[PDB]
């Protein structure tokens, strides 16, 4: 496998120490993955996703008219870190808590990078994030009473387009501290929805989780591999290939506060 | 099917009149397809072919380094023409030779367009044609005696790279008129090769047809569909999606004459 | 079928793109259909619904007395729109979000027309809407406390006529914003009823959903058919034949606010 893992000087039981640690922090820090849906991994060779359109390049008077097919190129990221090799060997002498502080700090730089692509998009990549669809904004206020009014007025914009599913509220974590009062009034105006507090946006946004409006395309899910061995340390990396696209911008609404 | 053929006012026996005519002219006029090999059609939705490389876009001091995956976008061409509808109806009264002169003139504009992409490449498409690999040139002359010497010196450049298969000579059609003398001396210096005279290049070139050095990627092979009906005529089109890439430039040699 | 759908230049997979879109907006925008009941479609030839009465036209001294039987004529509506044909063809190249903005704007003109017939009735059609039965009005106020009192006084008018079923509250959407406070006090004074906020009336009204008091007669449910093909566009239409009649006006009460 392209992740040369059977070449690293680590025991088969030391590898699972590293895997569990990274798999626990990814589950809680990948916020985009809590309301978008993932098209299963297509493999390490997948390179572009079809947009389904032609881009004409010929003249208006030509006999043979032609153009190129547009697609979306996949982003590939690689983040490397180092582990002290003596400390990892203490795990064989029966030590339950080894020092992976270099693994966890790097797992959080990657999770935070993958969320600027979903929320803010990437200029060079050709990705539009959720926060740029700014013709879907609506006012709000400061009191728990007014958050309720912004959600009943948002569900009328959904039902006016035929978007009707389970609804979700993605809200900043410091704004939520003020609305802790009506946390069961809110979660039932959404009709048994779900509140996802996140330190990745300032304001809030409501989305319809009926399925198929925000796709995360995965070529290769997050993996850990082996790079090189320095004197008394190994150098590993985290890799992934993905892209993101909003299909229906009608299933999204931005609250302004 | 995307070719709305069951909506054209043509009999199932008038459609095969049109298909046979276009299939006979494509067999003789698509010269590139006589020594390159075709990766079977991937479908009407295929949009890009992987080049197998990453293009880095991050800084040198960043923690999470990333880049985009390079691919080759597929060209889609459409050429339309018109058929008089009364003349096509004479085919039902038992007429063997109807007038498809509008079909054949358009089938030759398409075949000739598809060969500038293989021999000269396309700047905007991102395709390199055979005639640009100009570090593989070698001299020649004017007499049949010297054409033989240029082929024995070309087969020594092949065997020096380990390229050893059946060999082919693609030569201009007006140059060949001079070498008609030794047409069996030539075709056995190539070791039972094959001569393909073509009005698509000035000089000649020798290629190794062992397999896998010049790939034509087909999304949708050449097809005929229906567009619209004017007053007393139908309007059809010829469509195709393809791309071309040289894998090993060592299996090619350009003679200069 | 009278909807000449097998004559439109659309793929069997492009037709379902159009059907799902119109079926999703009708489900949320046809508000009358949420508390009235529908007598199944009688077909495309049904033309009139019997009122069950005779209208005498003879003299008082005649030997043979005669009259005509009264019925209710069915309304037939047709709304046409246009779709760009190139954009629909992008759906075959694998595009999930094509532009049907001309379909959805027309589906909302039709849904809103069908609701003026239920709420305001039609003079020429011979239909009485719910809002004209104005001998069933009762006062209300402005505070959540008073909305509760208007519902306990309304359920005593129902039980005085023997109308006893599940109860429903159909209220303007901008009035509801004020009563968001007691949304579980309200929905249990109705004895586990149901609140249907709608932008189709100013005030509110309470109805008994026991069955058989408000009938919507359907000849042909909402359908999409094919009309003609312009140069680079198709022209489709939405059709339907229906009529509406209140059977028992005792199962209805109008709140005045
Ligand atoms: C008792 C003992 C146990 C050790 N266990 C490990 C170990 O499990 N993994 C490891 O990478 N180095 C371990 N080391 C360190 C190496 O054996 C080696 O002594 C050190 O990396 C460099 O030694 P130097 O000062 O001679 O260059 C251990 C050293 C000692 C004295
Ligand atoms: C590469 C290419 C692809 C095309 N594909 C379509 C198509 O799928 N459907 C269509 O109606 N017209 C298509 N056209 C337009 C044709 O020229 C058509 O005969 C005419 O332009 C229709 O009018 P329009 O350009 O406004 O669509 C295409 C043109 C080109 C150059």
Q: Would you tell me how many other CB atoms lie within 10 Å of the CB of residue A107?
A: 23
Q: Which of B1, B7, B43 to mutate to test the interface with C (most CBs of C within 10 A)?
A: B7
The pair of three-digit structure tokens given for residue C128, joined into one six-digit string: 């009485």
CA of A2 to the centre of ligand 2 (A): 44
**Rounded distance, CA B99 to CA B81, Å?**
13
Q: Which of A67, A78, A125 sits opposite B68 (nearest CB)?
A: A125
**Rounded distance, CA A121 to CA A245, Å?**
9
Cβ within 8 Å of residue B32, ≥6 positions away: B114, B115, B118, B119, B216, B244
Residue C227: strand, helix, or coil: strand
- Alpha carbons within 13 angstroms on the beta-carbon side of residue A95 total 13
User: Is the CB of A50 less than 8 angstroms away from the CB of B51?
Assistant: no
Q: Which residues pair with B216 in a beta bridge?
A: B38, B244
Which ligand is located closest to the Cα atom of residue A68? 2
Which helix (H) or strand (E) segment holds residue C35: the answer is: none
- Check pocket membership of C86 for ligand 2, CB cut-off 6 A: yes
B75 to chain A, closest Cα gap in Å: 5
CA of C232 to the centre of ligand 2 (A): 9
Which ligand is located closest to the Cα atom of residue B226? 2
Contact A51, B38 (CB under 8 A): no
**Rounded distance, CA A204 to CA A169, Å?**
7
Contact B129, B117 (CB under 8 A): yes
**Rounded distance, CA A130 to CA A32, Å?**
10
Q: Where are the alpha helices (DSSP H) in chain C?
A: 12-29, 85-89, 101-119, 144-159, 173-176, 183-189
Torsion angle in degrees (nearest 10) through CA of A173, A175, A178, A181: -60
User: Is the CB of C89 less than 8 angstroms away from the CB of B2?
Assistant: yes
**Rounded distance, CA A38 to CA B62, Å?**
27
| B221 marked as binding residue | no
**Rounded distance, CA B165 to CA B35, Å?**
12
**Rounded distance, CA C166 to CA C150, Å?**
17
Of the candidates A32, A31, A41, A23, the residue with the CA atom closest to the CA atom of residue A107: A23
Strand arrangement, sheet containing B48-56: A37-39, A214-229, A233-246, A75-84, B65-73, B48-56
Token pair 């793929």 is found at C11
Strands A37-39, A214-229: pairing kind = parallel
To one decimal, the resolution in angstroms is 3.0
**Rounded distance, CA B86 to CA A167, Å?**
60
CA of A236 to the centre of ligand 1 (A): 21
Q: Which of C5, C88, C93 to mutate to test the interface with B (most CBs of B within 10 A)?
A: C93
Contact B249, B148 (CB under 8 A): no
**Rounded distance, CA A77 to CA A239, Å?**
6
C245 to chain B, closest Cα gap in Å: 44
| A79 marked as binding residue | yes
**CA-CA-CA-CA torsion sign (B140, B145, B149, B150):** positive
Q: Which residues pair with A78 in a beta bridge?
A: A239, B65
Cβ within 8 Å of residue C20, ≥6 positions away: none
Q: Would you tell me how many other CB atoms lie within 10 Å of the CB of residue C151?
A: 21
CA separation (Å) from A133 to A147, A202, A212, B171? 21, 15, 17, 58
**Rounded distance, CA A91 to CA B194, Å?**
68
CA of B129 to the centre of ligand 1 (A): 59
**Rounded distance, CA B10 to CA B236, Å?**
11
CA of A95 to the centre of ligand 1 (A): 17
**DSSP character for C182?**
T
- Check pocket membership of A85 for ligand 1, CB cut-off 6 A: yes
Of the candidates A197, A193, A135, A142, the residue with the CA atom closest to the CA atom of residue A168: A193
**Helices C12-29 and C101-119, packing angle to 10 deg:** 40
**Rounded distance, CA C175 to CA B111, Å?**
69
Q: Which of B7, B45, B47 sits opposite C9 (nearest CB)?
A: B7
Cβ within 8 Å of residue C90, ≥6 positions away: A52, A53, C98
Contact B250, B163 (CB under 8 A): yes
Contact B169, B190 (CB under 8 A): yes
- Closest C-alpha residue for ligand 2 atom 18: B227
**Rounded distance, CA A117 to CA B58, Å?**
14
**Rounded distance, CA B109 to CA A107, Å?**
56
- Check pocket membership of A9 for ligand 2, CB cut-off 6 A: no
**Rounded distance, CA B207 to CA B192, Å?**
14
**Rounded distance, CA A81 to CA C13, Å?**
50
**Rounded distance, CA B205 to CA A140, Å?**
72
**DSSP character for C252?**
E
Cα B50–Cα B52–Cα B55 angle in degrees, nearest 5? 105
Which ligand is located closest to the Cα atom of residue A86? 1
Contact B103, B237 (CB under 8 A): no
The pair of three-digit structure tokens given for residue C23, joined into one six-digit string: 């079926």
Of the candidates A137, A113, A129, the residue with the CA atom closest to the CA atom of residue A206: A137
CA separation (Å) from C87 to A54, B254, C177, C234? 11, 45, 41, 11
Q: Would you tell me how many other CB atoms lie within 10 Å of the CB of residue A83?
A: 20
Torsion angle in degrees (nearest 10) through CA of B134, B137, B142, B144: -130
SS3 of chain A: the string is CCCCHHHCCCCHHHHHHHHHHHHHHHHHHCCHHHCCEEECCCCCCCCEEEEEEEEECCCCCCCCEEEEEEEEECEEEEEEEEEEHHHHHCCCCCCCCCCCHHHHHHHHHHHHHHHHHHHCCECCCCECCHHHCHHHEECCCCCHHHHHHHHHHHHHHHHCCCCCCCEEEEEEHHHHHHHCCCHHHHHHHCCCCCEEEECCCCCEEEEECCCCCEEEEEEEEEEEEEEEECCCEEEEEEEEEEEEEECCHHHEEEECC
**Rounded distance, CA C171 to CA A35, Å?**
32
User: Is the CB of B50 less than 8 angstroms away from the CB of A46?
Assistant: yes
Contact C227, C111 (CB under 8 A): no
A158 to chain B, closest Cα gap in Å: 31
Contact A114, A79 (CB under 8 A): no
Residue B206: strand, helix, or coil: strand
User: Is the CB of A159 less than 8 angstroms away from the CB of C104?
Assistant: no
- Alpha carbons within 13 angstroms on the beta-carbon side of residue A52 total 15
Q: Would you tell me how many other CB atoms lie within 10 Å of the CB of residue C39?
A: 10
Of how many residues is chain C composed?
257
A252 to chain C, closest Cα gap in Å: 15
Which of A89, A90, A230 best tests ligand 1's pocket when mutated (most atoms within 8 Å of CB)?
A89
**Rounded distance, CA A221 to CA B185, Å?**
60
Q: What backbone phi and psi angles, to 5 degrees, belong to C94?
A: 80, 60
User: Is the CB of C92 less than 8 angstroms away from the CB of B7?
Assistant: no
**Rounded distance, CA A167 to CA A196, Å?**
11
End-to-end alpha-carbon separation of chain C, Å? 49
**Helices B12-29 and B101-119, packing angle to 10 deg:** 40
- Check pocket membership of A112 for ligand 1, CB cut-off 6 A: no
CA of B19 to the centre of ligand 2 (A): 22
Of the candidates A74, A92, A65, the residue with the CA atom closest to the CA atom of residue A221: A74
- Check pocket membership of B78 for ligand 2, CB cut-off 6 A: yes
**Rounded distance, CA C144 to CA C123, Å?**
37
**Rounded distance, CA A225 to CA B253, Å?**
42
Residue of C nearest to B43 (CA): C93
**Helices A12-29 and A101-119, packing angle to 10 deg:** 40
| B5 marked as binding residue | no
Contact C112, C30 (CB under 8 A): no
């Amino acid at each position: 496998e392209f992740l040369k893992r059977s070449f690293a000087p680590l025991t088969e039981k030391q590898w699972q120490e590293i895997d569990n640690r990274a798999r626990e922090i990814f589950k809680t820090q990948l916020y985009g993955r809590k309301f978008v849906d993932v098209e299963g991994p297509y493999g390490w060779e997948y390179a572009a996703h079809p947009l389904g359109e032609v881009e004409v390049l010929s003249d208006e008077n030509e006999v043979v008219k032609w153009g190129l097919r547009k697609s979306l190129p996949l982003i590939e990221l690689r983040a490397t870190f180092t582990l002290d090799l003596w400390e990892l060997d203490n795990l064989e002498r029966g030590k339950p808590n080894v020092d992976l502080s270099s693994l966890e700090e790097t797992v959080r730089k990657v999770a935070e990078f993958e969320d600027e692509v979903i929320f803010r998009g990437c200029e060079k990549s050709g990705v539009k994030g959720l926060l740029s669809f700014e013709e879907r904004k609506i006012e709000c206020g400061s009191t728990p009473k007014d958050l309720l009014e912004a959600i009943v007025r948002a569900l009328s914009i959904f039902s006016k387009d035929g978007i009707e599913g389970p609804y979700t509220l993605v809200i900043n974590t410091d704004r939520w501290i003020n609305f802790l009062g009506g946390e069961k009034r809110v979660e039932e105006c959404l009709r048994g929805g779900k509140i996802i507090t996140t330190p990745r946006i300032e304001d809030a946004l409501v989305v319809s989780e009926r399925g198929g409006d925000f796709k995360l395309i995965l070529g290769q899910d997050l993996s850990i591999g082996y790079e090189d061995r320095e004197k008394d340390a190994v150098r590993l990396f985290i890799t992934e290939t993905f892209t993101f696209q909003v299909v229906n911008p009608e299933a999204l609404i931005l609250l302004k506060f």
